[PDB]
Each structure stands twice: as structure tokens, then as C-alpha cells.
Design a protein around this ligand. Sequence first.
Ligand SMILES: *[C@@](=O)([N][N]C(=O)[C]([C][C]([C])[C])[N]C(=O)O[C]C1=[C][C]=[C][C]=[C]1)[N][N]C(=O)C1=[C]C(O[C]C2=[C][C]=[C][C]=[C]2)=[C][C]=[C]1
Length: 215
Amino acid sequence: APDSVDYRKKGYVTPVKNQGQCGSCWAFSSVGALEGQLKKKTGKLLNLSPQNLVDCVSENDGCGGGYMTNAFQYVQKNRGIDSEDAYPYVGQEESCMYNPTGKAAKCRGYREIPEGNEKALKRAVARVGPVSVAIDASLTSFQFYSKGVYYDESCNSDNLNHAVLAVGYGIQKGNKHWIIKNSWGENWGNKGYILMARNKNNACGIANLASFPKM
Ligand SMILES: *[C@@](=O)([N][N]C(=O)[C]([C][C]([C])[C])[N]C(=O)O[C]C1=[C][C]=[C][C]=[C]1)[N][N]C(=O)C1=[C]C(O[C]C2=[C][C]=[C][C]=[C]2)=[C][C]=[C]1
């Protein structure tokens, strides 16, 4: 093997969830980052609560959207985030029902990756683990993706609408790629994941809004 890393084989990635009709794609991506780190330090993985983020991160719009950096900042200020079981996901805004007794993780800040620098992203995923990214998933090609390495020259790096999680990187039929985890269920794309193009001149803005929490 050359320069390839898949955290799935490692146990840093939890099962693929489905955001539903709520636009909490930012909360799931952040949770993904947090979870990847929780394995890195604790040696044990656990499903964190995306709802907790949705209901408590006042700086975001709940099901209307939000940024990953704001979510991390919340977990730090709040000093902890509940596990899924402790604070279940219902797919809609409601009152923040944080349960201190249910805290299962915490963090001390975050570090945004250099805007538009793919290489700094490869290292971040290689040295830290799953990274929260933001891409353009408006095109139908992306939506009906099934297999192989995605790459559509119509993708717009400036229009960042869907937030996902980079679980790693690797090669395919000569095509380098970023292993992406989406929150649309195990029934979308390749069992919930998608292989997007790497080094194709920041395809879809993969490295345009990356970040990861610090433990
Ligand atoms: C998410 O649902 N909402 N995304 C965002 O709020 C993100 C936040 C991160 C920062 C990326 N985008 C964002 O804030 O954009 C700002 C920006 C732009 C340009 C430069 C810098 C910053 N994304 N949603 C979709 O792609 C989407 C999702 C659904 O979900 C429903 C569904 C769930 C399961 C199965 C099927 C469907 C619906 C419509 C669109």
C-alpha cells in the first residue's frame, strides 16, 4: 500500500446515519469528527448526539443549517456532548435538553484547515483522523452516485451546501480519492459513502471549509 488511509477499517467511524428531512448535515459531520477523536484518545468509540448539537448550538439555525466550527466551539464552552442514547435524534428542532449525566465526550477547540489547500487536508486526515468538510452536492451526478471515483467539472467550489466527513483518502483505477461519509442513510451511494476525486483542483471545494476538533 502507498499513501492510503481508511479509518473505517480502524474503528474510528461509526455506522452511517440519515439526517432525514432536517438540514442537520453540519451536526452529523461534526459528531463524526468528534467520534473519530474519541477513538484516537479513549480507545473506545461511541455514537455522539447530532440532535444535541441541533438543539443547543444557538449560533446555528438547527434544521436550517450551520457550521461545524460553531458546533465544536459549543462543545468546548459547554464542556461536553451527550451520547446518542442519552440524547436521541428525532429529526427536528426542539428545546436543548442537555444531560450532564449523559456527557460522553468533550474537546478544547478546533483548527480550520488552510482554505483551499488539499495537501494540508491529506495531512490533517493522516495525522488527526476524520475531518469535517463542506462540499457542493447540488448536482444530480453526485446525488445518484453509485460507485467509482466521482468528479464533475460543473461542481462549484464556491457553492458549499452539504457538510460531510472525510474518512480518509486513497487511489482507485489510477484515480486518487477522498473517502466521504454522508448522512443520507446506508441506502445512498455506496452503502452510505462516496469516493470523491482528490487533487482534481479542489473538486467541489472539498478543502474549502475543513476543520477538526482538538482533544
Ligand atoms: C446540509 O443539510 N446543510 N448544510 C449546511 O448548512 C452547510 C454547512 C457547512 C458549513 C458546510 N453549508 C453551508 O453552511 O454553506 C455556506 C457556505 C457556502 C459557500 C462558502 C462557504 C460557506 N446540506 N444539505 C444538502 O445537501 C441537502 C440535504 C437535504 O437532506 C435531506 C435528506 C436526508 C436523507 C436522505 C435524503 C435527503 C435536502 C436538501 C439538500
